[PDB]
Design an enzyme around this catalytic site. Structure first.
Site, PDB file in Angstrom:
ATOM      1  N   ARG A  70      45.506  30.882  19.191  1.00  0.00           N
ATOM      2  CA  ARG A  70      44.180  30.493  19.573  1.00  0.00           C
ATOM      3  C   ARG A  70      42.951  30.591  18.732  1.00  0.00           C
ATOM      4  O   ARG A  70      42.220  29.494  18.799  1.00  0.00           O
ATOM      5  CB  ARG A  70      43.763  31.075  21.077  1.00  0.00           C
ATOM      6  CG  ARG A  70      44.767  29.951  22.237  1.00  0.00           C
ATOM      7  CD  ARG A  70      44.310  30.864  23.397  1.00  0.00           C
ATOM      8  NE  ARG A  70      44.878  32.382  23.299  1.00  0.00           N
ATOM      9  CZ  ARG A  70      44.795  33.272  24.468  1.00  0.00           C
ATOM     10  NH1 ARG A  70      44.116  32.797  25.473  1.00  0.00           N
ATOM     11  NH2 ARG A  70      45.299  34.488  24.265  1.00  0.00           N
ATOM     12  N   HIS A  74      50.002  26.459  19.313  1.00  0.00           N
ATOM     13  CA  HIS A  74      48.854  26.057  19.988  1.00  0.00           C
ATOM     14  C   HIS A  74      48.360  24.964  19.132  1.00  0.00           C
ATOM     15  O   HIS A  74      47.891  23.833  20.102  1.00  0.00           O
ATOM     16  CB  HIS A  74      47.559  27.257  19.877  1.00  0.00           C
ATOM     17  CG  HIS A  74      46.424  26.667  20.537  1.00  0.00           C
ATOM     18  ND1 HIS A  74      46.318  26.667  21.869  1.00  0.00           N
ATOM     19  CD2 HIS A  74      45.188  26.447  20.145  1.00  0.00           C
ATOM     20  CE1 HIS A  74      44.862  26.253  22.125  1.00  0.00           C
ATOM     21  NE2 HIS A  74      44.288  26.028  21.101  1.00  0.00           N
ATOM     22  N   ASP A  92      42.562  19.870  29.872  1.00  0.00           N
ATOM     23  CA  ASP A  92      41.494  19.291  28.969  1.00  0.00           C
ATOM     24  C   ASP A  92      41.426  18.645  27.821  1.00  0.00           C
ATOM     25  O   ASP A  92      42.706  18.053  27.725  1.00  0.00           O
ATOM     26  CB  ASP A  92      41.087  21.044  28.484  1.00  0.00           C
ATOM     27  CG  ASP A  92      41.993  21.773  27.697  1.00  0.00           C
ATOM     28  OD1 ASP A  92      43.239  22.024  28.018  1.00  0.00           O
ATOM     29  OD2 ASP A  92      41.731  21.830  26.441  1.00  0.00           O
ATOM     30  N   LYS A 145      35.318  18.145  30.603  1.00  0.00           N
ATOM     31  CA  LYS A 145      34.380  18.907  30.934  1.00  0.00           C
ATOM     32  C   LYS A 145      32.858  18.814  30.153  1.00  0.00           C
ATOM     33  O   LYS A 145      33.010  18.799  28.942  1.00  0.00           O
ATOM     34  CB  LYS A 145      34.677  20.415  30.592  1.00  0.00           C
ATOM     35  CG  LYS A 145      35.988  20.927  31.310  1.00  0.00           C
ATOM     36  CD  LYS A 145      36.524  22.245  30.678  1.00  0.00           C
ATOM     37  CE  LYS A 145      38.106  22.433  31.025  1.00  0.00           C
ATOM     38  NZ  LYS A 145      38.473  22.668  32.446  1.00  0.00           N
ATOM     39  N   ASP A 180      50.054  22.039  30.066  1.00  0.00           N
ATOM     40  CA  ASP A 180      49.653  22.797  28.998  1.00  0.00           C
ATOM     41  C   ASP A 180      50.608  23.695  28.189  1.00  0.00           C
ATOM     42  O   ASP A 180      51.774  23.923  28.436  1.00  0.00           O
ATOM     43  CB  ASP A 180      48.588  23.990  29.751  1.00  0.00           C
ATOM     44  CG  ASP A 180      47.241  24.010  29.142  1.00  0.00           C
ATOM     45  OD1 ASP A 180      47.097  23.528  27.987  1.00  0.00           O
ATOM     46  OD2 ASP A 180      46.306  24.511  29.673  1.00  0.00           O
ATOM     47  N   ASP A 227      47.142  31.484  30.629  1.00  0.00           N
ATOM     48  CA  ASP A 227      46.849  32.885  30.449  1.00  0.00           C
ATOM     49  C   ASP A 227      46.381  33.441  31.718  1.00  0.00           C
ATOM     50  O   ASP A 227      47.086  34.397  32.479  1.00  0.00           O
ATOM     51  CB  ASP A 227      45.887  33.151  29.311  1.00  0.00           C
ATOM     52  CG  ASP A 227      45.500  34.628  28.975  1.00  0.00           C
ATOM     53  OD1 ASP A 227      45.456  35.453  29.829  1.00  0.00           O
ATOM     54  OD2 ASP A 227      45.295  34.742  27.978  1.00  0.00           O
ATOM     55  N   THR A 228      45.135  33.280  32.195  1.00  0.00           N
ATOM     56  CA  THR A 228      44.194  33.980  33.130  1.00  0.00           C
ATOM     57  C   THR A 228      44.882  32.703  34.299  1.00  0.00           C
ATOM     58  O   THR A 228      44.545  33.348  35.759  1.00  0.00           O
ATOM     59  CB  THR A 228      42.885  34.159  33.199  1.00  0.00           C
ATOM     60  OG1 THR A 228      42.274  32.946  32.938  1.00  0.00           O
ATOM     61  CG2 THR A 228      42.524  35.096  32.116  1.00  0.00           C
ATOM     62  N   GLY A 229      45.040  31.487  34.295  1.00  0.00           N
ATOM     63  CA  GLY A 229      44.944  30.585  35.422  1.00  0.00           C
ATOM     64  C   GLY A 229      43.888  29.908  35.815  1.00  0.00           C
ATOM     65  O   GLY A 229      43.942  29.214  36.851  1.00  0.00           O
ATOM     66  N   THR A 235      41.483  27.820  34.083  1.00  0.00           N
ATOM     67  CA  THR A 235      41.308  26.326  33.929  1.00  0.00           C
ATOM     68  C   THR A 235      42.293  25.597  34.571  1.00  0.00           C
ATOM     69  O   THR A 235      42.244  24.384  35.347  1.00  0.00           O
ATOM     70  CB  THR A 235      41.577  26.173  32.351  1.00  0.00           C
ATOM     71  OG1 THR A 235      40.596  26.605  31.740  1.00  0.00           O
ATOM     72  CG2 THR A 235      42.059  24.575  31.973  1.00  0.00           C
TER      73      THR A 235
END
Lengths: 298, 298, 298, 298, 298, 298
Positions: E95, E129, E169, E193, E212, E216-218, E220
């Site tokens: 990233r 990525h 995104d 966005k 995707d 990661d954290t969920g 988005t």
């Protein structure tokens, strides 16, 4: 001695007419169907020691009414009825009284055996398809005839006419001969079927009395009317004891040329089976006289 | 010796399943109705000298199918069949096996007498309403039981559960006792009716096997499910041999709490009687084994 | 004045159809379930000062969708909506609108009270099980009828036929009478249940319009079809507003004799509930007109 | 005065335990589902004039059980119950007790209003998510605490240990403080989340008592175990009143480092939710005492 | 030529699966930590002259596993390995592949330089990525794609559905375009966005495939599910190569509406990260084929 | 010329002490961890053209801090820093400075190569495990010694004593010899390990100065104290530059006989590692003087 009259649910008007002639009420009973089709029967007063007359007509659906009559006869046998007479104004399975080609039942004989096994001592019927059915039952069989009733009516209204009695097929010529004698010795004719249709005898310009034991779908009888018309008949009158009158028979008979169709009420003639040329004579007085004579027993 | 299998029209899938298990064809015949309702029967190959098995189920309308069976038996008797066995997977009029305190028929006895008079030498039936019906017929009566079949299925799918066998009324407690033994000696309970309803025995937290000979309207059995539910049953399973399933029974059973309803196909289970909890097991293998043993002197 | 349309998740097609007729987008909202079953609701744009219409249908599982509608109404009340109308095309618990001889709830009245407590100022519904349900809510209740829509369709396609309107039970005879008037003053018949089933009225040779408020399992309605068939009906057409169509109803109705089954889309008619005789008419134009009239407010 | 206990179907073991402690049978009732999802309720004995306690737990699927409780309360109100207390051991929608910065419902307040509208005079609950929920109902609310029960058990088995009470998040620190006092004035720690996770307080070498109101998916609590492990905790014990234990929680908790997980049976702990470290204490004696005190009414 | 497979400790199940597909054993080694955190590595058989493949996945804590891989490569370089290929199924620091408008490192480039300095001759990775990371290493970089694997699975199970591919995104639209082509040329949409969120494209009534590179954290991805849900999507399926699944992502994804979440095992999916909608496909066959081709000059 | 001081997060007290001595603020930066473990670094003021000193200590967990330092050096290289000096007060992997038996890495050499590749021009360290590590880096390496600092303190407080310098193993005898010279030419002893333990030299009645480069778990050093005790030492003093002090070392050292344990703060000495005999001297003034001399550059 005690006369008791029992009736199934198939033909309530006849039962009521017979009861009135005898001045005896129909014996109270519960008669009902489980959703299954099984019949439940219970007598609501004592039947011990009675001379029982079990009246059931056999319209469609016929097997249900035959089982109801057998069930009632079983109940009277187990309830100590002294004598049981089954009255079947239209005898079910009467047309199956021989094997024809074969590997068939003789259903008319089976009906008599089943009535005997249920406990019946006597059978009373009106205008059997064949007179020999009287020998199918091991016991008294009173075979009542509507001939006097039907010819008496035809004599009152068509005495002025020039009559020929016509049998719609070869099987029924003998009975037709009996009618011709009753109507003053008039001529006779019948429809010959080759396996074409032909009238044998002279009907040209005559009032034809077409006589049969029963009218079912009206096919044979309507065919005969049209044939007699083609052979120059002035008029055609249809007379039969049993009005089964299934399917298109009411429409068939109303649209065929016949001036009158005369039947008895051995079977219930509902409003769907009625039409303008139709005349219904009551068999009740004949049935009441037969019950009285059996009951009086000398 | 020659085995011939005859079938009436009431339940064609059962007849085909039995025929497959025996590896014999159903004997060809013409079976049709006059508009009247009178049944016509004719065998389209020779039946002289055969060991005949006449299979007829008795769904609504029942009296028609009873007459069809009697007519077929009359025909085999007049066609010189050597031995005639009547197979009646659901015995008609079995519930009317006593007078219930007068003045009633004993219709179950009448059925046996009529089968004898028609010419039957043997009767085969599955789970009679009472075992004493076996004495109503003057001759051999093979009374087959579906218990092993039904408890075998329940054993496969509910062995893990904590079971109680429940009888929905006082008449069936003895059979329920037999099932409890078959299921490994589990406890027993039944519904007591005062003439209120009460459960006699402990069902709290248990998987109830509600067992009956037949389900007709579903009134008694649905009542029992609700009562068991009120007494804290974890679940209820319904098992019966005969699915008569008249009227609102399908709606009634589907809406009651029961997890499963298990029946055999002694009667045809049409698509109107079906619902999601319903399971149908075949009685054909049992019928085929009985026919083979009767035929083989087994 | 600002019109905003909110929809639950139960019946997205109806919401989309209604939105299209009005030319208003459905308001954005997050509507999702915790694993628990607790519903989470959040509006993703402002609702302050709006005239809100909250549309929720109530298919299985019904209590979840009822709670989702109550939760949305609570959120609009706390978000300062000016006026809140609840739209329930199929009114949940409508069948439980009286005690049926105790000791029962009146669940239809409870639903109206709960909607009032949540903050609803109006209720809009389509063909309530009974008209009196309109009095259960302390406020305006627009009771929309699909009768014109259903009889209009039947009039276009069966004007040539000889019609009788038939009620499947004694409870619906009055509405059936209204339909007969809409169809040009045709005759009326209904199924009488004695606690056996009988048709009262003449249907012989006629095209029967069997009318009911809803079809659930299809048991009663399939029973009525068969009864009408037995009584000599030429044709049977089924018409109902609400197609609940649970369980075996799709299979039951497809295999009963009915030529057509007509419903609206007050409930979502998924592809598992579809069959060839099934016709679905949209209730959306009726709902959009009612919303517009309520919103226009004179 | 007459005490009657009613129970929904969601959690039969708790109802049976409470009934046993009180020595009162659960009142008989029919409680069943239409295929629709509509609940049908009927009381099978008189409820007129009783002090009624309606016990319902609210596991998945939760909205159904909430509606069943409301329906039962409506029926008691229309059946002339004198006083109605709703018992909700796990209060549904307790987590939604504020808006969380708009535009949301306050679902916990809606639940209290719906219970009031249905006819409830009192609410009894165990360890509400927030104590302020007691003010949501216009009437008595008995808020029972399991703290003594849980800390009593921890005191019997871990008195020898060197304890720290740990709150898994900033919201529960006050209750955690109460527990530390109950356990003899031991130290306190909690997980701080910056919007990374950090333990605030010293846990190195200590036996941690991780306390929460409920365990749902086990995500937050498993995360806290791992964090405490990383910070050098000797041992972790999990204690919560409500074991919702959906999804992977049983597997997650069994494989995280925790030595013990202690819950009550406010929700039914089925065999799929069980694991070796799990201990379940009964809430029944606490519920029975509260019912008795409410009923005794001084 | 001699193929030797070395594995770090981070992801032992992947190493075992790869070894099985190749039919080679993992080379024996001692790999342990001083209390300090310093890693000790020693090979327990000869490595002179081998073609070495050093497999290391990079889950949390990531910098430890990166150093372990660098240390192993140093040891192979000093042990006279002929060729060293580093396999990094999830490329660490991918990233951070640009400065994002200063003053930052390009960490992805640093990783490639450190691998080169340690002695690696080749890098193998799965779904970088950005594709341009391939240019960060002065030497061959085999960039493997899981697209065929993920779309093949989606094609098997959702061919019946009406699909739209959605990018969460603006960065991933090109890959999403490739997936739409693989799935039969279906439509495309993405979340725009503004620095609000908007869906660009039509998803109403469609089955959305949200694609995707990693989760990661969920945050988005959950946001995107809720947005699609609000725009009337029938369903949502999440597919990603790398399941990093940190923090609340498991809770978050399980609670969001998604029907399925599909990932590969490039990272070890421990039992804390699991949930019911989660499906894990193996990347091992793809890795084994790449190693075989690199080794065989294929 | 512009001096800029950068610091990682591992040892904030040291960074602050060094900054104070130089009178230069630490350069502002954002330094944070993704849940992954990936480090994010951003400088919050300009770094173009500076002489940068990047200070990072390397306590547990060590690999994270090594990557943070490399990432900061990358960022300064891409941000056009003129000169970059890495300061590693405790040099990570210093103990792995040769192969031992073999098939091992030389990790200390790999660290120097990675720092060079990241962009470092100079390395500054304190008391390397071996002086030859200075040759591992292709560029200036300032190897600072704490000897004067530690012996100066021991000279101030134990001048009155009769001293022997003791090396805890054979590797460290040369440094121990340097200390004995600094302390006024006192005698020397060391622990001989046979692969038993023996003291070689006379320590009877003497104050022993046990000198090591670092103390890690305290095993070797505690063993040496006990051995010297057994050989009749009056007193034992422990002196080392680096206090790694992992695991039980604090407890081990506090419970062994030693009168004093003297360390520097090259590593952060947290409160868990503290004990009463422990004395910590600051390395900051030495580091500040070295930075000043490098920066002044003649």
């Amino acid at each position: 001695k005690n006369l008791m009259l029992f009736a199934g649910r198939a033909h309530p008007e006849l039962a009521d007419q017979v009861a009135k002639e005898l001045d005896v009420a129909v014996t109270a009973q519960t008669a009902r169907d489980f959703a299954n089709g099984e019949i439940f029967v219970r007598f609501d007063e004592s039947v011990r020691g009675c001379d029982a007359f079990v009246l059931q007509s056999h319209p469609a659906p016929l097997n249900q009414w035959l089982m109801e009559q057998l069930i009632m006869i079983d109940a009277l046998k187990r309830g100590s009825a002294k004598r049981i007479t089954a009255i079947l104004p239209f005898y079910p399975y009467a047309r199956q009284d021989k094997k024809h080609r074969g590997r068939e039942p003789i259903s008319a004989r089976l009906v008599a055996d089943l009535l005997k096994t249920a406990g019946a001592d006597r059978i009373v019927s009106v205008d059997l398809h064949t007179d020999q059915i009287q020998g199918f039952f091991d016991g008294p069989v009173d075979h009542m005839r509507a001939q006097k009733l039907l010819t008496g009516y035809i004599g009152e209204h068509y005495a002025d006419e020039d009559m020929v009695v016509v049998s719609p097929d070869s099987g029924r010529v003998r009975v037709a001969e009996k009618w011709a004698d009753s109507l003053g010795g008039v001529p006779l004719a019948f429809i010959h079927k080759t396996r074409s249709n032909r009238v044998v005898g002279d009907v040209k310009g005559k009032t034809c009395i077409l006589t049969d034991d029963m009218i079912d779908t009206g096919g044979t009888i309507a065919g005969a009317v049209n044939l007699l018309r083609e052979d120059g008949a002035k008029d055609v009158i249809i007379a039969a004891t049993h009005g089964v009158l299934s399917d298109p028979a009411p429409q068939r008979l109303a649209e065929c040329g016949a001036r009158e169709v005369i039947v008895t009420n051995t079977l219930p003639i509902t409003e769907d089976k009625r039409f303008p040329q139709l005349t219904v004579l009551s068999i009740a007085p004949l049935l009441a006289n037969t019950i009285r004579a059996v009951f009086e027993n000398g």
